[PDB]
From Swiss-Prot:
The record marks N98 as: Acetylated histone binding. The gene is BRD4. There is a cross-link at K57 (Glycyl lysine isopeptide (Lys-Gly) (interchain with G-Cter in SUMO2)). JQ1, a thieno-triazolo-1,4-diazepine derivative, and I-BET, a benzodiazepine derivative, have been tested on tumors with success. Treatment with GSK1210151A (I-BET151, a I-BET derivative) has strong effets on mixed lineage leukemia and promotes myeloid differentiation and leukemia stem-cell depletion. The NET domain mediates interaction with a number of chromatin proteins involved in transcription regulation (NSD3, JMJD6, CHD4, GLTSCR1 and ATAD5). This is Bromodomain-containing protein 4. Chromatin reader protein that recognizes and binds acetylated histones and plays a key role in transmission of epigenetic memory across cell divisions and transcription regulation. Remains associated with acetylated chromatin throughout the entire cell cycle and provides epigenetic memory for postmitotic G1 gene transcription by preserving acetylated chromatin status and maintaining high-order chromatin structure. During interphase, plays a key role in regulating the transcription of signal-inducible genes by associating with the P-TEFb complex and recruiting it to promoters. Transmembrane segments: none annotated.
């Protein structure tokens, strides 16, 4: 009941190594990675392990920091806005499937605020 995770490599996609993309890996992702609340987001949702077979009935564009990290390490992105957009998908997924109040949402909201704070200023 687990779909194939998002791709982390795609030879036919044009890639760039921009300064902002390096920053997103170095500074932004690797900071969020170490947060107390990062652990549920460090790998795809395992609907089987969690016995939540309804998760992928609801969430149709899955994303996680582990996938984003692998995309960054593999230079998958063209620009930073593309990466940021995957971050936003991850957070939105969590808010979609869960409800205000839920502990997983407090974690997501907390990570998000750190995330927004970190990307408020990107390198030139
Ligand atoms: C506070 C907390 C409670 C349970 C767990 S977990 O061990 O079960 N592992 C786990 C990892 C990621 C998620 C979830 C569980 N849930 C929430 C129902 C929990 C869903 C599927 C919705 C989610 O969107 N994400 C992002 C971790 C933290």
């Amino acid at each position: 009941m687990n779909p194939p995770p998002p791709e982390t490599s795609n030879p036919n996609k044009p890639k760039r190594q921009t300064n902002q993309l390096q920053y997103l890996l170095r500074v932004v992702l690797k900071t969020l990675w170490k947060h107390q609340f990062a652990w549920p987001f460090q790998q795809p949702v395992d609907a089987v392990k969690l016995n939540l077979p309804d998760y992928y009935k609801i969430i149709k564009t899955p994303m996680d920091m582990g996938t984003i990290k692998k995309r960054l390490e593999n230079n998958y992105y063209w620009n930073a806005q593309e990466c940021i957009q995957d971050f936003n998908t991850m957070f939105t997924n969590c808010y979609i499937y869960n409800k205000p109040g839920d502990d997983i949402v407090l974690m997501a909201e907390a990570l998000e605020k750190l995330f927004l704070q970190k990307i408020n200023e990107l390198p030139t």
